[PDB]
Amino acid sequence: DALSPEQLVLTLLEAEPPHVLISRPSFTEASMMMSLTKLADKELVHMISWAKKIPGFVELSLFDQVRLLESCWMEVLMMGLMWRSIDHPGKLIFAPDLVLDRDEGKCVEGILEIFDMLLATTSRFRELKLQHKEYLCVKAMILLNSSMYATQDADSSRKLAHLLNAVTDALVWVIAKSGISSQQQSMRLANLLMLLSHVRHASNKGMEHLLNMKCKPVYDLLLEMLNAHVL
Ligand SMILES: Oc1ccc(CCNc2nc(SCCCc3ccc(Cl)cc3)nc(N3CCNCC3)n2)cc1
């Protein structure tokens, strides 16, 4: 119970996930995917601690929290990937150890399309000159919006709306602080939210390559983390 103007941006700042490290040698196909799996899993753990820290997230329903974390993990992952690779054209800084060149993608099939997508999206964010604050704000919006929107017992859908609300407000706020004119303050918001669907787009393709292995996805797998230990 809070959600203020900057007390949120600063909060979203101090809630950020830790940098994550993976073992490694070198590399080929599974070499790239043995790591990426051990990468996104370590991260998915911190992603939960993260959501947990967004003021009011735990006040929601448990099934809703899991509902939400299940839909965004992929784009939230890629949102942080892009942000880490924003000042590096052609590269995709997956982690302090996992840095991949564009070309290095083709060496494994299907993957190369995504790099083009990420790099393309990353370049757009770069060109817009996305700020650390706007980035913090867009990341949580992705988590608060990615859901299956009732079949009633609504007090969650209320609090959730109030939460997506505060974030969205902080974001128009950040843009306003920028000082530009209302025609531009609006265009900024519009340009940044239109990219979220490109992050969605890239999120769908990726998840499609993922499942294209032999499985069919972290549900309970990280269900008992919201459960008790809260770690
Ligand atoms: O901050 C981060 C950290 C990590 C990432 C990437 C996380 N990527 C990731 N990729 C695969 S990939 C087969 C992939 C083909 C492919 C190739 C390229 C891409 Cl981008 C996606 C998929 N599989 C998984 N997981 C994690 C959860 N348990 C089940 C498997 N994660 C992004 C941002």
Curated annotation (Swiss-Prot):
<comment type="similarity">
    <text>Belongs to the nuclear hormone receptor family. NR3 subfamily.</text>
</comment>
<feature type="domain" description="NR LBD">
    <location>
        <begin position="4"/>
        <end position="229"/>
    </location>
</feature>
<protein>
    <recommendedName>
        <fullName>Estrogen receptor beta</fullName>
    </recommendedName>
</protein>
<comment type="function">
    <text>Nuclear hormone receptor. Binds estrogens with an affinity similar to that of ESR1/ER-alpha, and activates expression of reporter genes containing estrogen response elements (ERE) in an estrogen-dependent manner.</text>
</comment>
<comment type="subunit">
    <text>Binds DNA as a homodimer. Can form a heterodimer with ESR1. Interacts with NCOA1, NCOA3, NCOA5 and NCOA6 coactivators, leading to a strong increase of transcription of target genes. Interacts with UBE1C. Interacts with AKAP13. Interacts with DNTTIP2. Interacts with isoform 4 of TXNRD1. Interacts with CCDC62 in the presence of estradiol/E2; this interaction seems to enhance the transcription of target genes, including cyclin-D1/CCND1 AP-1 promoter. Interacts with DNAAF4. Interacts with PRMT2. Interacts with CCAR2 (via N-terminus) in a ligand-independent manner.</text>
</comment>
